[PDB]
Design a protein around this nucleic acid. Sequence first.
RNA 1: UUUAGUU
RNA 2: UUUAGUU
RNA 3: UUUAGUU
RNA 4: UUUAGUU
RNA 5: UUUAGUU
RNA 6: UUUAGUU
Lengths: 143, 143, 143, 143, 143, 143
Amino acid sequence: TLHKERRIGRLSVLLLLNETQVEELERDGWKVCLGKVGSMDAHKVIAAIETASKKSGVIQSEGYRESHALYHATMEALHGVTRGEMLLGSLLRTVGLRFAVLRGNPYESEAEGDWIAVSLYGTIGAPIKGLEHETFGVGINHI
Amino acid sequence: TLHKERRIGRLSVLLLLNSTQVEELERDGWKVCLGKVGSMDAHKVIAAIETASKKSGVIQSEGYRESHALYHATMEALHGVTRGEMLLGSLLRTVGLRFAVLRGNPYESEAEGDWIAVSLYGTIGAPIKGLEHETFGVGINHI
Amino acid sequence: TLHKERRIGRLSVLLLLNSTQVEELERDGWKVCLGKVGSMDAHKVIAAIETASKKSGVIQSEGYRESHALYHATMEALHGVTRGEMLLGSLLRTVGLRFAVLRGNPYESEAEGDWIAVSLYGTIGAPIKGLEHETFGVGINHI
Amino acid sequence: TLHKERRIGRLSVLLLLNETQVEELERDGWKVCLGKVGSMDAHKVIAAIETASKKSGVIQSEGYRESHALYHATMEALHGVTRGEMLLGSLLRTVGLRFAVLRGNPYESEAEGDWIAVSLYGTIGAPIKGLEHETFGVGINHI
Amino acid sequence: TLHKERRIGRLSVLLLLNSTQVEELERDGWKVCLGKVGSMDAHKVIAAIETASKKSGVIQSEGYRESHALYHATMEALHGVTRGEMLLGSLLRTVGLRFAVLRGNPYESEAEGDWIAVSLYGTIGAPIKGLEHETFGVGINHI
Amino acid sequence: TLHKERRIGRLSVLLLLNETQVEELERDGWKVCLGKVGSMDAHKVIAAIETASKKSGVIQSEGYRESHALYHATMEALHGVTRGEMLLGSLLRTVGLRFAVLRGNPYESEAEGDWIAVSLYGTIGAPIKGLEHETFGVGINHI
RNA sequence: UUUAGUU
RNA sequence: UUUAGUU
RNA sequence: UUUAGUU
RNA sequence: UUUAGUU
RNA sequence: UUUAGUU
RNA sequence: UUUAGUU
Ligand SMILES: N[C@@H](Cc1c[nH]c[nH+]1)C(=O)O
Ligand SMILES: N[C@@H](Cc1c[nH]c[nH+]1)C(=O)O
Ligand SMILES: N[C@@H](Cc1c[nH]c[nH+]1)C(=O)O
Ligand SMILES: N[C@@H](Cc1c[nH]c[nH+]1)C(=O)O
Ligand SMILES: N[C@@H](Cc1c[nH]c[nH+]1)C(=O)O
Ligand SMILES: N[C@@H](Cc1c[nH]c[nH+]1)C(=O)O
Ligand SMILES: [Mg+2]
Ligand SMILES: [Mg+2]
Ligand SMILES: [Mg+2]
Ligand SMILES: [Mg+2]
Ligand SMILES: [Mg+2]
Ligand SMILES: [Mg+2]
């Protein structure tokens, strides 16, 4: 069962929606990294999240296993952001995002191992400043 | 442009993850609605959100206009929750959700009128207590 | 290339939005079928179109070949009607449709053989009379 | 309920499928604009529709509200045209379209306000003239 | 990199299209599971695969971790079977399937841990014996 | 009903998963062609399959009919390979594939005519050698 | 409408 | 990788 | 198969 | 923005 | 969990 | 058309 005080999803969102906390999370044994990326190319968003996650040590830079887990978590978070079509520029829209990647075990059973959450928050709109609204996305996966 | 102090998406999410914070929101002119629904039928989730919204006065009970706006905002929030297939029970999964519906103008220009945000947070998993993880979804629309 | 006077898609739509215009079409060699179905179950819409098509002789009742072509044409028309999720009742929505199935060769070359067009027009909305708007869909396939 | 003689969807399609009518619609209080665009890039289709709609006065050029309503209506019409994947050139296909955008209140109740319909008709096929078939799409949204 | 002699996807498919080839696989360290299910309800297909996998010991019966990995692998295999809409009966179609679940490390590096492959082969068609064609699906995930 | 020894889908897969056989199939009256293509652009995969199929005589190079049947069969096979989003490079992923296209009548009734199967097998992953796993896809259509 | 659940 | 943008 | 509908 | 196009 | 099915 | 690739 999900440990009420280790809800990886909720924690990653709160961190993202409040501009320290990283330090408190790390003290709790969590692996975290924060970043920002804006683009009309989804691959640039994906790349930024992976590159920040590997450089901050949230996931191993060697091997495929963890990169695979992160890719799919990112894909799931992008569903919330794109809502139907995982396309940005080709559909004449752009995104400005802030992201957080959190890694650790959110369950009461230590046997569940590590899980990873990718959270995204920002704006999506036409390529004109102001012609936009907020967007959110959260993807969760096992490691 | 979006008003920093009136970010409807972020505000609805913070309320959902939290005292009548509703009072503060309402004092600032926002129409707010909070609820909870769990089911293996997406239509029940959709119905709960609509019913709570109309009863609480977040949207007009009469006419189609506002119901149309809410329906589509709900659809967009469901994308974040379902991530690919807007199906629950038919794909052997269930959801336990908490939801918030916020209505008001998040832009600096009063000419942008009212917008609506539907936010969802909870768990999705196999029909077995514990075999689940967190899920999130936010949909925004003009109304 | 498509024959200007034999544009199967346009012709099926004009018939649907309209006298035995069917007679004229049939006189020109077209196999025509007209019907109406309303439901919160997509399978019922699909079944009505197939049944009407085979009874009216628009497609062979025997074999799979032609049923396969019609099924996929129906699927494509349903995309225009559902726009994203090929779901009706499970997403708390209902459809009231009028449909037309036209069969014949729309190209200048007789070697292109027969093609089939499934056109749909009606309303889609919440399960409440009035809380709805128009919906449209056209699917085209070789047969 | 939908006013039988103000069916915005049907009207926009008929206008599109019959090469005046614009004048008659405008006399009835409707806002209309007709255009044509062909491309292997969906964003060019979207851009043409928005640019023609704002220059013809169908939607306000200032603010986001109406641009947002039009974008989503265009997205919905594109579902009918693309049928599954909102991709053109990346899936080795091209489209040649004629489009119509109609704005007004299609309901009996004046309280329903303005709604907008984006209708598309043309051909989609491989990037070779002749290797194509018809395509249609209609999206409807509130303003 | 993937080990030429341990290509989990290819091996699971060859087994499905074939003696205890299972014995050879098991002798090489693979955890194998074979089954068959037919239905117009995707959840039944999903359930059969999970139940057979846990009973045969392909994945842990306890905890969520491994069930989560299997669920997503099953979802991915279902994409190949359904091709667009992960729906069976609601779209008036039925499936008759044979399935295989293989678990083990397909890479040269032992650090990649275990991965799981879900393969499906059978027929999909209208609810009439004969009006059908073959269908295939393979999903791969880390576990 | 499907002829047990003329299962076009199974046959195309076996041919693809075992490095002659083409000769045996051709002797049985089958039309076959094998190829390989790798890319981060789906259109290049589609193009390679069409170009190899027309040059090997699996489908007629003249007219649209057969090209249309092949395009849709290829689209269906790509669903198995992409699993949700028919995107490669835009989602920061690449594919290395081997493909087979088989043409003939897989049914017991000679009246069912010719059908076509497009089968794909290879790897999909991040654009780094090794960071990948297997992928499969099979599409079947009537001619 | 006032959080779901077993193959 | 250290938030995008004009038809 | 001969247009649907309430949380 | 004033219909696209070759593997 | 040990292959489905009629408008 | 005669298997792709670095943020
Ligand atoms: N409103 C769009 C973004 C957009 C594009 N153009 C204008 N707005 C969305 O929901 O993603
Ligand atoms: N993991 C699934 C939910 C689930 C179903 N069964 C087990 N888990 C999801 O992401 O939606
Ligand atoms: N507006 C929805 C239909 C609907 C459901 N509830 C209200 N309206 C659509 O576009 O399909
Ligand atoms: N027939 C495809 C278009 C196409 C691409 N290549 C050949 N035809 C469609 O339905 O969109
Ligand atoms: N042809 C459909 C199945 C089907 C339904 N009805 C007839 N056939 C498919 O590809 O899934
Ligand atoms: N694992 C992805 C491919 C990938 C992209 N990056 C890393 N892997 C898939 O299933 O398609
Ligand atoms: Mg993967
Ligand atoms: Mg709508
Ligand atoms: Mg089929
Ligand atoms: Mg929007
Ligand atoms: Mg999951
Ligand atoms: Mg087509």
